[PDB]
C-alpha cells in the first residue's frame, strides 16, 4: 500500500472509534449537567478520560503519515487536525502539575466566597451574590467592597498558581515550535499554504490593533457620555477628565456596561420597550419560546429542529427532584443528536437567548455534512457571531410586531432608536476595549515583555490608557486581578469576543443585503429571506473544511475582519453622542485616581 492508502485505512479506523467514544463522553457530560449525581460524575470523568486517552494515542500514530506525501486534501486536513490535537511533548511531571494548577485555579474561582467586615457572617459567593451587588447597587463604597474583596481574597490565591501556569504553558507552546502560549492561541486564526487566503499569527495583532484605532472615536464619545452620566449618579467620586472607577461599570470587571442603561438612558421619558409583559399576557411558556425560535430559522429556509431535539432537550429548570447546571448551552453530542439545556423563564432576554443558542444548533447541524475532525466553526470567533446575528434580527421592532409581542401600530421614533443603540453600545462597544486590553496583557505576559514584578503595574496602566478605566485602590504585585475573571483562571482565549463582534456585523450587513433590507442596519430582520438563509447555510456546512478567510469571503465578499459594518450599525448613535458631548471633555487622564 502507498502511504496515502495506509492513511485512509488509519482515518476510517479512527473515525469509527471517535464517533462512538465522543458520543459516550458528550452524552455522559449532558447527563451530569442535567442531573448532578455521583454516578453521573464517574461516568463523565471515565468517558472523558477514555476519549482523551484515545485522542493522544491516535495523534502520536498520525505522525507515521507525512502530510506532504498526501495528494488527497480531505485526509490531509483531517490528519493535520489529528496532529494538532496531540498533547505528548510536555514532561509527565510538568503535564500532571499543569493539570493540577488548572483544577486548583478553576476551583478557587468557582468556590471564591467573601464575607463583610461589617458582617463576618455576610459571606457572598460570586454567583449570584457579588454579581447581584455589581449589577444593581448605586452604593459606591458597597460596589467598592465587592470589587476589592473579590480581587484581594480570590485573586491573591491565584497570583502564585498563575505564575507557575504561565511558565508551564510557555514550555508546551515552545516545545511545539510556537514563540509563546499567546502565539499558540493566535494559532487558532492561522491559515498556512492556501494561495489567496493565508493568514499569520502576527497578522492578527496588527488587524486587531488597526480595527481598534477605527473603533476608538466611538468608544471615546460613549465613554465621555457614560462618564457625564456617572457624575450625576456619584457626585463626589468622578472627575470630568478622568478614567471611570473600575467598580462602577455594571459588573464585577466592566466586561459589559449593559447594567448602566438605567443611569445613561438618552430618553428615560420613553416607556420600557421590553415585551416580557406581552409574553406573560399571551401566556408564553418555554416550548412556545423555542417553537418561535424554530420558526425563524424555517423562514430563512433552514431545517426544523429534530424529533431528538424536542424529545431530549431540557427547556425548563427541572426543580429539586433533579439538580441541573442552569447556564444556557447548546449541545452537539454526535450521531444525529442535538439538544439545548436552558432554565428558560418567560422574558424577552430568554427569548433572545434561545435564538442565539438555536443558532449554535443550526451551525452544528449544517457541518454534520463534514468529517468528524472538521465539525468545528471556521475559527473560534464564528460560533459566537452566528449566535449573535440571530438575536440581532429577533430583537428588532419589525420582528416583534410580526410575532405579535409588539402591537401592529408600535411607533418607532429617533428616541426609541437612540435608546436601542445606546443599550446595544453599552454591551457591544463597551466590551471591545476591555476585550482587546485583557488579551493584550496576556499576549505580553506570555511573550515575556511584562516581568512578574510589573504584572499589576502594567495591567492597570493598560486599563487606564486603552480602556479609560482606573482602579479605586492601589494594587501591588500580590494581586492577580486578571485571574479574577473566569476566562483567565480557566485557560480560555479571549480575543474570540473581539473577532466575533466584527464578524457579526459583517454577517448581518451581507445577510440584510441578500434580504433586500431598506434603511438603518439596526432595524433589519432577515426573517422570511430564503436568499439570506442560503448565503448563511453555505458557510455553516463548511465547518473547518476551508480557511476562515474563504468562509467569511463566501458570505460577505471579503477575506478579513472589517470594522466598517460595526461602525455603520452605530453611526446614528455616534452622531448623537458627539452632539451630547459638544460641552463634555472627550478623552481621559491616565494618572487621575479615586485614591489620588
Amino acid at each position: 500500500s502507498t502511504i496515502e492508502e495506509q492513511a485512509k485505512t488509519f482515518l476510517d479506523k479512527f473515525n469509527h472509534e471517535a464517533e462512538d467514544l465522543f458520543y459516550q463522553s458528550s452524552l455522559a457530560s449532558w447527563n451530569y449537567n442535567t442531573n448532578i449525581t455521583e454516578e453521573n460524575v464517574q461516568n463523565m470523568n471515565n468517558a472523558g478520560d477514555k476519549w482523551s486517552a484515545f485522542l493522544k494515542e491516535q495523534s502520536t500514530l498520525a505522525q507515521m503519515y507525512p502530510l506532504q506525501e498526501i495528494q488527497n486534501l480531505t485526509v490531509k486536513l483531517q490528519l493535520q487536525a489529528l496532529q494538532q490535537n496531540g498533547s505528548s511533548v510536555l514532561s509527565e511531571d510538568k503535564s500532571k502539575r499543569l493539570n493540577t494548577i488548572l483544577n486548583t485555579m478553576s476551583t478557587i474561582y468557582s468556590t471564591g466566597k467573601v464575607c463583610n467586615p461589617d458582617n463576618p457572617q455576610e459571606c457572598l459567593l460570586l454567583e449570584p451574590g457579588l454579581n447581584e451587588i455589581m449589577a444593581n447597587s448605586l452604593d459606591y463604597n458597597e460596589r467598592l467592597w465587592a470589587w476589592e474583596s473579590w480581587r484581594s481574597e480570590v485573586g491573591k490565591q491565584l497570583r502564585p498558581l498563575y505564575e507557575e501556569y504561565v511558565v508551564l504553558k510557555n514550555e508546551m507552546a515552545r516545545a511545539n515550535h510556537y514563540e509563546d502560549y499567546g502565539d499558540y492561541w493566535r494559532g487558532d486564526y492561522e491559515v498556512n499554504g492556501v494561495d489567496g487566503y493565508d493568514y499569520s499569527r502576527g497578522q492578527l495583532i496588527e488587524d486587531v490593533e488597526h480595527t481598534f484605532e477605527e473603533i476608538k472615536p466611538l468608544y471615546e464619545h460613549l465613554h465621555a457620555y457614560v462618564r457625564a452620566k456617572l457624575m450625576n449618579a456619584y457626585p463626589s467620586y468622578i472627575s470630568p477628565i478622568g478614567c471611570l472607577p473600575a467598580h462602577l461599570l455594571g459588573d464585577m470587571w466592566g466586561r459589559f456596561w449593559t447594567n448602566l442603561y438605567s443611569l445613561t438612558v438618552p430618553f428615560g421619558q420613553k416607556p420600557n420597550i421590553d415585551v416580557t409583559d406581552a409574553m406573560v399576557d399571551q401566556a408564553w411558556d418555554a416550548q412556545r419560546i423555542f417553537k418561535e425560535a424554530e420558526k425563524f430559522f424555517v423562514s430563512v429556509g433552514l431545517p426544523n429542529m429534530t424529533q431528538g431535539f424536542w424529545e431530549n432537550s431540557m427547556l425548563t429548570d427541572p426543580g429539586n427532584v433533579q439538580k441541573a447546571v442552569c447556564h444556557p448551552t447548546a449541545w452537539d453530542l454526535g450521531k444525529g443528536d442535538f439538544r439545548i439545556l436552558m432554565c428558560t423563564k418567560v422574558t424577552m432576554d430568554d427569548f433572545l437567548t434561545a435564538h442565539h443558542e438555536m443558532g449554535h444548533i443550526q451551525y452544528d447541524m449544517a457541518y454534520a455534512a463534514q468529517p468528524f475532525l472538521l465539525r468545528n466553526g471556521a475559527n473560534e470567533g464564528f460560533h459566537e457571531a452566528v449566535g449573535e446575528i440571530m438575536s440581532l434580527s429577533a430583537a428588532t421592532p419589525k420582528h416583534l410586531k410580526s410575532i405579535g409581542l409588539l402591537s401592529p401600530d408600535f411607533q418607532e421614533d429617533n428616541e426609541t432608536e437612540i435608546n436601542f443603540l445606546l443599550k446595544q453600545a453599552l454591551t457591544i462597544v463597551g466590551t471591545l476595549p476591555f476585550t482587546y486590553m485583557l488579551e493584550k496583557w496576556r499576549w505580553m505576559v506570555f511573550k515575556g515583555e511584562i516581568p512578574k514584578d510589573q504584572w499589576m503595574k502594567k495591567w492597570w496602566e493598560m486599563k487606564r490608557e486603552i480602556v479609560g478605566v482606573v482602579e479605586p485602590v492601589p494594587h501591588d504585585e500580590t494581586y492577580c486581578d486578571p485571574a479574577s475573571l473566569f476566562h483567565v483562571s480557566n485557560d480560555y482565549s479571549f480575543i474570540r469576543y473581539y473577532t466575533r463582534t466584527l464578524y457579526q456585523f459583517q454577517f448581518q450587513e451581507a445577510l440584510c443585503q441578500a434580504a433586500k433590507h431598506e434603511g438603518p442596519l439596526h432595524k433589519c430582520d432577515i426573517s422570511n429571506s430564503t436568499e439570506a438563509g442560503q448565503k448563511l447555510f453555505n458557510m455553516l456546512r463548511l465547518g473547518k473544511s476551508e480557511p476562515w478567510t474563504l468562509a467569511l469571503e463566501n458570505v460577505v465578499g471579503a477575506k478579513n475582519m472589517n470594522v466598517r459594518p460595526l461602525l455603520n450599525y452605530f453611526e446614528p448613535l455616534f452622531t448623537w453622542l458627539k452632539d451630547q458631548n459638544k460641552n463634555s471633555f472627550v478623552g481621559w487622564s491616565t494618572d487621575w485616581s479615586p485614591y489620588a
Partner: peptide, 17 residues
Amino acid sequence: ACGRQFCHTLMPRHLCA
C-alpha cells in the same frame, strides 16, 4: 484540545476531569 466541542458554553475546568 479535544478534537471538537460537544457544547458552546465554556465550562469550569474542574469537571474537566
